[PDB]
Amino acid sequence: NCETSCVQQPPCFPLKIPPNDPRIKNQADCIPFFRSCPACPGSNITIRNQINALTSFVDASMVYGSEEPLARNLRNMSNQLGLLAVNQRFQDNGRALLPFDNLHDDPCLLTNRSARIPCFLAGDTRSSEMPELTSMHTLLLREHNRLATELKSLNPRWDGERLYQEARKIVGAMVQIITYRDYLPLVLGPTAMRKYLPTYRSYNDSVDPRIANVFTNAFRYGHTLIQPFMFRLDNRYQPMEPNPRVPLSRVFFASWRVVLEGGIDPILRGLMATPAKLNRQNQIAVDEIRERLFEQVMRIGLDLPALNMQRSRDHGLPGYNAWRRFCGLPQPETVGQLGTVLRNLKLARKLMEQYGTPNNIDIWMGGVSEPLKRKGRVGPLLACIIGTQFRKLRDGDRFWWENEGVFSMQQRQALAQISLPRIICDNTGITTVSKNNIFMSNSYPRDFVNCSTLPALNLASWRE
Amino acid sequence: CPEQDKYRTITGMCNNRRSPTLGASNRAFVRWLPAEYEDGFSLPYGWTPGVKRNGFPVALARAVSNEIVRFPTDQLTPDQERSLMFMQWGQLLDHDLDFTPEP
Numbered sequence: 001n002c003e004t005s006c007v008q009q010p011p012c013f014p015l016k017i018p019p020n021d022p023r024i025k026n027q028a029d030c031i032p033f034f035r036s037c038p039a040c041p042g043s044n045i046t047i048r049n050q051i052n053a054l055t056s057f058v059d060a061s062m063v064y065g066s067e068e069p070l071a072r073n074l075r076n077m078s079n080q081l082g083l084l085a086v087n088q089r090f091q092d093n094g095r096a097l098l099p100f101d102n103l104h105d106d107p108c109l110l111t112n113r114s115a116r117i118p119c120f121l122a123g124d125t126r127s128s129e130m131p132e133l134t135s136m137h138t139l140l141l142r143e144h145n146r147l148a149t150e151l152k153s154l155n156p157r158w159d160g161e162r163l164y165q166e167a168r169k170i171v172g173a174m175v176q177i178i179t180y181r182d183y184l185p186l187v188l189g190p191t192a193m194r195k196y197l198p199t200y201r202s203y204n205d206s207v208d209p210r211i212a213n214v215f216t217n218a219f220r221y222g223h224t225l226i227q228p229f230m231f232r233l234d235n236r237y238q239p240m241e242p243n244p245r246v247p248l249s250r251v252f253f254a255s256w257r258v259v260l261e262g263g264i265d266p267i268l269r270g271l272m273a274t275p276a277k278l279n280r281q282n283q284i285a286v287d288e289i290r291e292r293l294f295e296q297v298m299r300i301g302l303d304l305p306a307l308n309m310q311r312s313r314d315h316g317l318p319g320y321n322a323w324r325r326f327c328g329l330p331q332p333e334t335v336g337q338l339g340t341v342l343r344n345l346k347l348a349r350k351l352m353e354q355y356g357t358p359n360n361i362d363i364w365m366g367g368v369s370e371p372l373k374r375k376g377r378v379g380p381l382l383a384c385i386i387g388t389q390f391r392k393l394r395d396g397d398r399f400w401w402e403n404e405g406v407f408s409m410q411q412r413q414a415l416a417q418i419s420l421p422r423i424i425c426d427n428t429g430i431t432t433v434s435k436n437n438i439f440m441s442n443s444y445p446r447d448f449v450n451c452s453t454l455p456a457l458n459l460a461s462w463r464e
Numbered sequence: 465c466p467e468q469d470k471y472r473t474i475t476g477m478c479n480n481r482r483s484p485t486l487g488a489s490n491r492a493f494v495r496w497l498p499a500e501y502e503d504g505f506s507l508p509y510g511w512t513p514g515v516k517r518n519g520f521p522v523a524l525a526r527a528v529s530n531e532i533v534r535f536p537t538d539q540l541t542p543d544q545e546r547s548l549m550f551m552q553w554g555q556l557l558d559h560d561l562d563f564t565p566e567p
């Protein structure tokens with residue numbers, strides 16, 4: 001009974017309360033925590049490991065699913081148009097919305113007792129976690145049906161199975177293109193991008209494409225970027241009243257905000273024209289996720305940075321210096337050494353106050369404490385963990401968009417044009433998208449452009 | 465395992481023909497380093513009261529959050545060079561790669 005008990009009995013590993021806590025004044029209470037499922041339940045031979053419920057590939061399994069029964073249930077099985085099923089109750093100003101999920105204890109109904117709006121059904125179970133994430137999912141489902149609709153007018157002889165797969169292969173390829181060309185260089189920085197992700201040659205079958213255990217805690221660097229509000233904007237990119245600067249503690253699982261508060265368009269406009277939160281050694285993560293994570297739908301609001309650290313211990317991940325060594329990076333022993341590595345002896349003394357030694361620093365804590373790599377948003381350690389993962393995901397993917405046989409030379413030429421701003425134009429009522437690169441363009445109107453200037457993806461090379 | 469194929473499987477099964485489960489869903493993560501547990505095989509550090517890690521007491525994850533992570537909401541720094549879409553794409557992409565189930 002992890003959600004309600006403080007007793008440390010398996011599968012519970014609750015976070016104990018420190019004295020003089022800034023919020024939890026009761027030391028008999030705790031932050032609930034369920035130990036991750038063992039790969040080998042109850043063994044006394046195997047070193048406990050955890051499961052990845054998804055496909056490691058960048059195959060857009062957050063749209064199509066990673067298991068067969070779910071995949072079918074996401075597809076419109078009424079016609080031979082090869083479409084992805086849509087909400088049959090509500091529509092975002094005519095445009096499609098993710099279908100609702102039949103859940104037992106639905107947390108999305110808790111966020112507003114009078115709205116009676118449940119969670120959404122997508123490729124991945126976490127669709128309704130934040131409306132910003134739901135919007136991105138709503139955008140991709142629209143693209144699958146935009147692609148299969150356009151694909152039918154092109155090749156009418158093609159059946160539903162031929163329509164679904166081809167539209168799936170396109171979406172998947174778009175996810176790899178935005179990720180590798182636009183996303184990753186801004187995460188790693190020029191130097192790490194060149195080191196960890198040199199130019200694609202061809203798929204290699206000896207490259208292990210699995211997600212490493214540490215990647216699951218390391219990629220959580222993303223938590224440091226989290227802004228404390230959901231920013232909604234009008235057709236003119238001005239604050240959209242009512243609720244234009246809504247706190248995140250009131251947006252988690254708040255699916256009703258998509259269905260009853262102007263659709264995905266003010267949300268999507270906000271992600272384009274609002275700056276991300278920058279990571280500073282004295283400004284690591286906001287209190288909306290550090291003190292009020294899922295306040296509405298739980299007995300207590302959780303602490304994301306602290307769950308990140310408990311999860312690394314649950315997963316038995318080695319500490320900071322072990323990973324530093326793994327990457328070929330120096331391993332500080334002293335507070336002066338850590339001070340030099342972090343370029344901040346105030347933080348080094350603080351990290352030594354808690355951990356005692358740089359060996360014990362939790363991977364996420366150590367990772368996010370490092371100075372940011374030039375034109376990147378991670379330090380040398382996380383750049384190594386993240387870069388290595390993504391190389392394997394590309395170099396060990398038989399269906400990588402650039403591998404010989406996957407797409408024709410012309411398809412590759414057509415696919416190379418795509419951009420997230422164009423996809424936002426192709427599927428919404430947003431007339432003013434962002435000038436490439438979408439991840440750097442954060443100010444209106446300085447960084448913004450009109451849809452007519454954006455070239456759409458031409459499916460002429462798909463004509464059979 | 466099919467001899468010739470044009471599309472991906474839903475599960476990732478058969479992407480690597482030599483080791484057909486690699487990258488496929490509902491399988492154990494790979495490990496880049498051996499795991500470090502209290503007992504060497506399952507108990508996490510911090511589980512048993514008084515049990516040190518590498519010769520030092522184990523700091524409560526919440527105390528680390530309070531002492532290093534905590535900051536005044538007002539004193540926030542906006543990224544001059546990044547949009548919030550950069551954040552949101554990261555979480556969406558994370559959701560294409562991994563999900564660690566709990567009971």
Ligand code: HEM
Pocket residue numbers: 129130215216217219220221222223225226248289304307308311551552553554555558562563564565
């Ligand atoms: C405000 C939005 C976000 C919320 C509320 C959120 C929430 C969470 C929560 C509650 C967990 C599970 C924590 C646990 O019990 O150990 C989690 C895990 C994770 N998050 Fe975040 N997260 C967000 C954004 C991001 C971003 C932007 C990234 C990366 C760019 C990211 C990467 C991850 C990863 C890898 C995990 C573990 C995934 C797994 O294997 O289950 N998160 N996040």
Ligand SMILES: *[C@@H]1O[C@H](CO)[C@@H](O[C@@H]2O[C@H](CO)[C@@H](O)[C@H](O)[C@H]2NC(C)=O)[C@H](O)[C@H]1NC(C)=O
Pocket residue numbers: 112113114115242256260
């Ligand atoms: C939960 O959702 C309901 C929608 O049913 C919200 O109701 C709207 O609230 C605003 C308040 O300014 C008004 O436009 C209307 O009075 C409401 N419309 C309807 C149809 O009820 C309600 O505010 C939400 N709950 C909370 C506590 O925020």
Ligand SMILES: [Ca+2]
Pocket residue numbers: 054055056057058059060061062560561
């Ligand atoms: Ca996937």
Ligand SMILES: [Cl-]
Pocket residue numbers: 212213214215494495496497
């Ligand atoms: Cl690992």
